[PDB]
Amino acid sequence: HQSDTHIFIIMGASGDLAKKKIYPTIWWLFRDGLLPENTFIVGYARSRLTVADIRKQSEPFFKATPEEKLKLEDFFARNSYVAGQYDDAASYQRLNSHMNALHLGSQANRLFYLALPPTVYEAVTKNIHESCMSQIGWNRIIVEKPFGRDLQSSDRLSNHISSLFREDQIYRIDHYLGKEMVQNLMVLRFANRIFGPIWNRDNIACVILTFKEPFGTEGRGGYFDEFGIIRDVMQNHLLQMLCLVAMEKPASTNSDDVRDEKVKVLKCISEVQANNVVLGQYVGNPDGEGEATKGYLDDPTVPRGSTTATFAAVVLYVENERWDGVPFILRCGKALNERKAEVRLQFHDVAGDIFHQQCKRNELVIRVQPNEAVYTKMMTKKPGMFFNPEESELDLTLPDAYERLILDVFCGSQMHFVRSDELREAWRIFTPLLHQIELEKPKPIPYIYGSRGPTEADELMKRVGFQYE
Amino acid sequence: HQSDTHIFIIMGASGDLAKKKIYPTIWWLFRDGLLPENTFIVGYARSRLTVADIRKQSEPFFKATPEEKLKLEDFFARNSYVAGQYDDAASYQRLNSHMNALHLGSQANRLFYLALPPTVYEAVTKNIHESCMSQIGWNRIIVEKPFGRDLQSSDRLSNHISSLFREDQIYRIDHYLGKEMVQNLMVLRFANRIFGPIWNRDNIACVILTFKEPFGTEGRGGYFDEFGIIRDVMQNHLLQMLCLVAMEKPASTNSDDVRDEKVKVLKCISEVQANNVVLGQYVGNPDGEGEATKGYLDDPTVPRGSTTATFAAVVLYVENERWDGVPFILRCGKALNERKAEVRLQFHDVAGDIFHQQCKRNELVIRVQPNEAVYTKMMTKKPGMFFNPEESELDLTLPDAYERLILDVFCGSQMHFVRSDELREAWRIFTPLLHQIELEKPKPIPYIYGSRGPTEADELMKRVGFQYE
């Protein structure tokens, strides 16, 4: 994918999401030439702007340097902007004409990016499929989360998008996915007989899937209330972790095979009520800071009396022979004590204790971020004149995660993007939970800003059987 | 064992073995005070000497400094010497009287050290049992290798020693044993479900037990001939490695249980034929600088036309449910390429190769010496944009081995010393082969001083199933 021209159409160029994360990401990719050499960027938005205005409002987040001002002005040499509405065939045809009025725009692999408001996904995708299809190269679409709110809405959206594009063209992206050691966990799991056969019900006691954040929801508090942590990260990213941990032997490790194993695991998950769900929400930190002094409900853009949770702890199980009866854990949140993303595989104790109850349950952490590291906290003898062992952390282990994911979109690798049927089954899993949520509006348990999360989650892992040192 | 007085009776104080290795070892242990505070040394030999003569003849090897000259003279302040023959009750009673004429010599735990020549073991042990027994404290002895030559001689000698002392008062020592990395193998085997359940026939492909020595037998070539590498290191040290690796369901880590499981494993191995044997012997190096210019047969003290081997590779296959049908490899020798003592636990390949045959058989090396270190050469993905793994050496990891074994003899820990019945069964499984050896005088295959050993050993590893990459 380094020869044929590509177009990275950023719908919503004036959008805050674009200007804050997408344009700086493609700048990072373009200063180092990770995108293909003949890469075009064609923004699009309602507001009538220009390339100079884009420069003026986006340079500070690009944070370029006088050393590579030349590379910067080459980066804007590939840029362009188109003005139009989101539901009008006239402006859509104008966008198509502008795209075709480039270096083989029709031949260019139009890699659409939907950074536009969530309320229009249906209409924008319908217009894109009707008018903005190039019949030469692949036309992938990047749909940003979330993909509906409950089972019925998600099914309708998925069926519409399936009737428009095929799954080879739909790319459901997840920003938080590391893709660096979510990829290394696969190698560790498959290329070992040390971890291979003990990847079953008898040996691995449980799996803890954690994704914490150090910052709250300052400013953009009006986007999280309608959605909730479950639909934001818990149902997409934590299920991605759970599926890539619980998947059976793919036997060909391709994207389709791994997603099919994900579908098999998910189809092997029974219904989940509130009995395996815990919710939590944060409030003002008494030891305040520049942004910690105000809680979630202190954000003026958040509607008063909103029961949207920012912490979700759920336990899943897989009803197949390899994973029969063995538990899995999902934990996440925002504004927690410290940024982290780990997958702790706690193994069973060896049947028959001989070190006088000193045997600690062997672990295997995959700390996706920050300071990426994989380590097995196995236990070995301490040097000296003794015999007793000590639990020791044994380390076993570069574009950023988001630009790596965009590069994977360019390459065509759909390993880490949820499938239509995978999403359908995933929503089927939590349909009772989501219906209860939208019916009764459950009240999450308050927790302190920058804490470790509600104690009910740790109690949930304890009920599962997870052992905390 | 820091209050009651101890005596380290070095029979053969004028002996070369004593003056070269035992007295410097107890000096190393005494400058740091690892012997009990009220420890005594009472040598003994045919030739008449004195403490000053011992000082003059043994000072240079202590490699001490004038700063610790005070500690050295304190170390010789507790030394002693008794003159007498090895087979005379009169001199034995003189020795006993000298012992009783000390600071509670009768109460002292006489820790005898049979460093005296092998040809007299029967008579010396009989006299020691008859006369030199203190009836107050424990009276252990350290019996040095080899423990007989064939099945019948070994059985007679072991039965006599059993009739004299119980198995609590016998220590079949093995200098080469590390006592540290062997000690960590036990922990790595027991305190993990990472290695525990896969410690069976289906997962561990084979085990390689290796022990090499860069220096030959210059000068002392008249000692190795009558014994052979099998009876020197293979049948003691390499079988100790095999028992520690293979023993089933050890139970309490105590000496009794570990040695019982050693007995069970050795009862679960059948007779060794000539078909599982490789022998080798070394010759001089044209390119060598020091001793390498002369080979084993170049030693004037070696009888001409001697077929004693210095390299022996024999594989065992323990026949019980946990280890049914597995290869266990023994490799050893002298004058090899470089010092080493490793246990390479090569596991099976995962059934179903999905990384396009990039999967290398997972290993686990336990380097006993030099530079003790455990590293699992497991395979993980190297950082990059490709979904490919790399075989990476992942490290897992203080007197020396002889000091720690002497301390073990002082403490009473008999986990590292071969048992009477264990020795009987090892000689029973080597009986047909050893009788054929003594009958036909097999000719070992020549190999180069300082090489890696005869190629037939690697052929043996390949035949049993060991994979070399």
CB contact burial B150-189 (16+ within 10 A = b; e otherwise)? ebeebbebbeebeebbebeebbbbbebbbbbbbbbbbbbb
Question: Angle between the B51-58 and B23-31 helix axes, to the nearest 10 degrees?
Answer: 90
Give the domain-ending residue among A139, A173, A190.
A139
**CATH code, domain with A129:** 3.40.50.720
Give SS3 for B333. coil
Alpha-carbon distance A348 to A323, whole Å?
Answer: 14
CA B220 to chain centre: 18
Residue A295 C-beta-side C-alpha neighbours within 13 Å: 16
**In B70-156, beta strands by DSSP E:** 109-114, 141-143
At residue A248, φ and ψ (nearest 5 deg) are -75, 180
Are B296 and B335 a contacting pair, CB within 8 Å?
A: yes
CA B418 to chain centre: 10
Task: Scan for tokens 């990719």, then name that residue.
Answer: A29
Whether residue A370 has a cis bond before it, omega within 30° of 0: yes
Selection from A48, A43, A108 nearest residue A80 by Cα: A43
Claim to verify: residue B100 and residue B186 sit in the same structural domain = no
* Nearest residue of chain B to residue A258 (CA atoms): B354
Cα separation values, B365 from A114, B57, B330, B369, Å: 52, 42, 15, 12
Residue A145 annotated as binding?
yes
Selection from A460, A228, A142, A438 nearest residue A330 by Cα: A460
Claim to verify: residue A129 and residue A269 sit in the same structural domain = no
Cα separation values, A351 from A201, B245, B261, Å: 15, 18, 17
Chain B partners of A326 at a C-beta cutoff of 8 Å?
none
Residue A375 annotated as binding?
yes
Give SS3 for B305. coil
CA B204 to chain centre: 25
Among B6, B237, B416, B435, the active-site one is B237
The first and second tokens of residue A278, run together, are 């815990």
Residue A408 annotated as binding?
no
Q: Is the dihedral of CA B69, B72, B78, B83 positive or negative?
A: negative
CB contact burial A225-255 (16+ within 10 A = b; e otherwise)? beebbbbbbbbbbbbbbbbbbbbbbbeebeb
Give the domain-ending residue among B79, B105, B139.
B139
The first and second tokens of residue B343, run together, are 């246990």
Alpha-carbon distance A217 to A335, whole Å?
Answer: 8
Contact A355 B194 (CB under 8 A): no
Q: Is the dihedral of CA A397, A398, A403, A409 positive or negative?
A: negative
Alpha-carbon distance A443 to B19, whole Å?
Answer: 82
The 3-state secondary structure of chain A, one letter per residue: CCCCCEEEEEECCCCHHHHHHHHHHHHHHHHCCCCCCCEEEEEEECCCCCHHHHHHHHHHHHCCCHHHHHHHHHHCCCEECCECCCCCHHHHHHHHHHHHCCCCCCCCEECEEECCCHHHHHHHHHHHHHHCCCCCCCCCEEECCCCCCCHHHHHHHHHHHHHHCCCCCEEECCCCCCCCCHHHHHHHHHCCCCCCCCCCCCCEEEEEEEEECCCCCCCCCCCCCCCHHHHHHHHHHHHHHHHHHHCCCCCCCCHHHHHHHHHHHHHCCCCCCHHHEEEEEEECCCCCCCCCCCCCCCCCCCCCCCCCCCEEEEEEEECCCCCECCEEEEEECCCCCCCEEEEEEEECCCCCCCCCCCCCCCCCEEECCCCCEEEECCEEECCCCCCCEEECCEECCCCCHHHHHHHHHHHCCCCCCCCHHHHHHHHHHCHHHHHHHHHHCCCCEEEECCCCCCHHHHHHHHHHCCCCC
Pairing of strands A340-347, A327-332: unpaired
Beta bridge partners of B362: none
Alpha-carbon distance B281 to B442, whole Å?
Answer: 11
Give the total number of structural domains in chain B.
2
Alpha-carbon distance A331 to B227, whole Å?
Answer: 65
Are B183 and B373 a contacting pair, CB within 8 Å?
A: no
Give SS3 for B354. coil
Alpha-carbon distance B1 to B407, whole Å?
Answer: 10
* Nearest residue of chain A to residue B356 (CA atoms): A252
The first and second tokens of residue A127, run together, are 């217009």
Contact B394 A394 (CB under 8 A): yes
The first and second tokens of residue B392, run together, are 């990476």
Is B400 near chain A, with CB under 8 Å? no
Contact B381 A193 (CB under 8 A): no
Beta bridge partners of B313: B278
Residue B111 lies in a domain: yes
- A273-302 residues touching B, CB cutoff 8 A: none
The first and second tokens of residue B16, run together, are 């070369």
Contact A348 B193 (CB under 8 A): yes
Q: Among B249, B352, B397, whose Cβ lies nearest the Cβ of A249?
A: B352
Pairing of strands B278-283, B311-313: antiparallel
Alpha-carbon distance B128 to B111, whole Å?
Answer: 12
Residue B411 exposed, middle or buried by CB count within 10 Å (0-12, 13-18, 19+): exposed
Contact A380 B191 (CB under 8 A): yes
Chain B partners of A385 at a C-beta cutoff of 8 Å?
404, 407
The first and second tokens of residue B65, run together, are 């400094």
Alpha-carbon distance A225 to A228, whole Å?
Answer: 6
Q: Residue B374: enclosing H or E segment and its boundaries?
A: strand B373-376
Pairing of strands A373-376, A365-367: antiparallel
What is the set of active-site residues of A? 237
Is B373 near chain A, with CB under 8 Å? no
Claim to verify: residue B237 and residue B110 sit in the same structural domain = no
Residue A168 lies in a domain: no
Cβ-proximal residues to B185 (8 Å cutoff; 6+ apart), any chain: B244, B245, B343, B366
Residue A276 lies in a domain: yes
Question: Angle between the B121-131 and B151-164 helix axes, to the nearest 10 degrees?
Answer: 10
Beta bridge partners of A24: none
Beta bridge partners of A314: A277, A330
Chain B partners of A198 at a C-beta cutoff of 8 Å?
193-194, 197-198
Q: What angle do CA A458, A461, A465 make, to 5 degrees?
A: 135
Contact A397 B380 (CB under 8 A): yes
Claim to verify: residue B10 and residue B110 sit in the same structural domain = yes
At residue B345, φ and ψ (nearest 5 deg) are -90, 85
Q: Residue B341: enclosing H or E segment and its boundaries?
A: strand B340-347
Are A9 and A45 a contacting pair, CB within 8 Å?
A: no
The first and second tokens of residue A309, run together, are 């949770």
Cα separation values, B394 from A342, A376, A394, B388, Å: 21, 11, 8, 18
Whether residue A60 has a cis bond before it, omega within 30° of 0: no
* Nearest residue of chain B to residue A184 (CA atoms): B381
Q: Residue B367: enclosing H or E segment and its boundaries?
A: strand B365-367
Task: Scan for tokens 């934001």, then name that residue.
Answer: A232
The first and second tokens of residue A347, run together, are 């193994």
Chain B partners of A383 at a C-beta cutoff of 8 Å?
398
How many other β-carbons are positioned within 10 Å of the β-carbon of residue A24? 20
Selection from A206, A110, A105, A175 nearest residue A369 by Cα: A175
* Nearest residue of chain A to residue B347 (CA atoms): A193
The first and second tokens of residue A313, run together, are 């702890």
Angular region, B160: left φ>0, alpha ψ -120 to 50, beta rest: alpha
Which amino acid appears at position A357 of this protein? Q
Contact A352 B394 (CB under 8 A): no
Alpha-carbon distance A292 to A335, whole Å?
Answer: 9
**CATH code, domain with A296:** 3.30.360.10
Contact B191 A347 (CB under 8 A): no
- B129-188 residues touching A, CB cutoff 8 A: 183-184, 186-188
Minimal CA separation from B392 to chain A, in Å: 9
Give SS3 for B199. coil
Helices (H), B343-469: 401-411, 420-440, 455-464
Claim to verify: residue B124 and residue B225 sit in the same structural domain = no
Residue B161 lies in a domain: no
Q: How many CB pairs under 8 A join A and B?
A: 133
Residue A194 exposed, middle or buried by CB count within 10 Å (0-12, 13-18, 19+): buried
Give SS3 for B53. helix
Contact B383 A398 (CB under 8 A): yes
Is B252 near chain A, with CB under 8 Å? yes
Question: Angle between the B23-31 and B69-77 helix axes, to the nearest 10 degrees?
Answer: 120
The first and second tokens of residue B86, run together, are 């090895």
Whether residue B370 has a cis bond before it, omega within 30° of 0: yes
Claim to verify: residue A251 and residue A312 sit in the same structural domain = yes
Cα separation values, B299 from A437, B212, B290, B302, B447, Å: 90, 20, 14, 6, 16
Is A378 near chain B, with CB under 8 Å? yes
The first and second tokens of residue B108, run together, are 């002292």
Claim to verify: residue A134 and residue A186 sit in the same structural domain = no
Residue B412 lies in a domain: no
Chain B partners of A350 at a C-beta cutoff of 8 Å?
190-193, 196-197
Cβ-proximal residues to B305 (8 Å cutoff; 6+ apart), any chain: none
Selection from B74, B85, B69, B87 nearest residue B35 by Cα: B74
Q: What's the Rg (C-alpha) of chain B?
A: 24
- A43-102 residues touching B, CB cutoff 8 A: none
Residue A161 lies in a domain: no
Are A377 and A363 a contacting pair, CB within 8 Å?
A: yes
Give the domain-ending residue among B84, B116, B139.
B139
Selection from A221, A235, A262, A217 nearest residue A176 by Cα: A235
DSSP code, position B307: -
Give SS3 for B28. helix
Pairing of strands A311-317, A327-332: antiparallel
CA B250 to chain centre: 21
Selection from B316, B308, B302 nearest residue B333 by Cα: B308
The first and second tokens of residue B214, run together, are 């860069």
Chain B interface disruption, residue of A2, A261, A378, most B CBs within 10 A: A378
Beta bridge partners of A357: none
Contact A193 B251 (CB under 8 A): no
The first and second tokens of residue A168, run together, are 């080879």
Is B195 near chain A, with CB under 8 Å? yes
Selection from A73, A61, A80 nearest residue A19 by Cα: A61
Are A349 and A361 a contacting pair, CB within 8 Å?
A: yes
Beta bridge partners of B11: B44, B114
Secondary structure (DSSP) of B211-226: EE-SS--SS-HHHHTT
Cβ-proximal residues to A357 (8 Å cutoff; 6+ apart), any chain: none
Residue A90 lies in a domain: yes
Chain B partners of A360 at a C-beta cutoff of 8 Å?
191
Whether residue A389 has a cis bond before it, omega within 30° of 0: no
Claim to verify: residue A268 and residue A327 sit in the same structural domain = yes
Is B396 near chain A, with CB under 8 Å? yes
Q: Among A187, A378, A380, whose Cβ lies nearest the Cβ of B381?
A: A187
Are A9 and A112 a contacting pair, CB within 8 Å?
A: yes
Chain A interface disruption, residue of B1, B194, B385, most A CBs within 10 A: B194
Alpha-carbon distance A359 to A375, whole Å?
Answer: 18
Helices (H), B32-88: 51-58, 69-77
Cβ-proximal residues to A254 (8 Å cutoff; 6+ apart), any chain: none
Selection from B329, B366, B394 nearest residue A192 by Cα: B394
Alpha-carbon distance A194 to A176, whole Å?
Answer: 30
Chain B partners of A348 at a C-beta cutoff of 8 Å?
193
Q: What angle do CA A206, A212, A217 make, to 5 degrees?
A: 145
Claim to verify: residue A262 and residue A331 sit in the same structural domain = yes
What is the domain range of residue A445? 182-401+419-464
Pairing of strands B204-212, B340-347: antiparallel
Q: Is the dihedral of CA A140, A145, A147, A151 positive or negative?
A: positive
Cα separation values, A194 from A203, B23, B48, B161, B188, Å: 12, 45, 61, 45, 13
Residue B126 annotated as binding?
no
The two counts, helices (H) then strands (E), for chain B are 15, 16
Alpha-carbon distance A257 to B247, whole Å?
Answer: 41
Claim to verify: residue A222 and residue A128 sit in the same structural domain = no
Alpha-carbon distance B271 to B294, whole Å?
Answer: 37
Alpha-carbon distance B109 to A196, whole Å?
Answer: 52
Claim to verify: residue A83 and residue A215 sit in the same structural domain = no
The first and second tokens of residue A194, run together, are 């040390």
Residue B21 annotated as binding?
no
Alpha-carbon distance B243 to B264, whole Å?
Answer: 9
Is A439 near chain B, with CB under 8 Å? no
Claim to verify: residue A43 and residue A190 sit in the same structural domain = no
Cβ-proximal residues to A79 (8 Å cutoff; 6+ apart), any chain: A41, A43, A51, A54
Question: Angle between the B23-31 and B401-411 helix axes, to the nearest 10 degrees?
Answer: 80
Contact B194 A194 (CB under 8 A): yes
Q: What angle do CA A11, A16, A17 make, to 5 degrees?
A: 65
Contact A350 B191 (CB under 8 A): yes
Alpha-carbon distance A363 to A27, whole Å?
Answer: 39
Beta bridge partners of A324: A318
Residue B232 annotated as binding?
yes
Residue B53 annotated as binding?
no
Task: Scan for tokens 């219904």, then name that residue.
Answer: A271
The first and second tokens of residue B39, run together, are 């420890």
Residue B347 lies in a domain: yes
Pairing of strands A340-347, A365-367: unpaired
Selection from A245, A234, A341 nearest residue A277 by Cα: A234
Is B358 near chain A, with CB under 8 Å? yes
Are A335 and A194 a contacting pair, CB within 8 Å?
A: no
Give SS3 for B415. coil
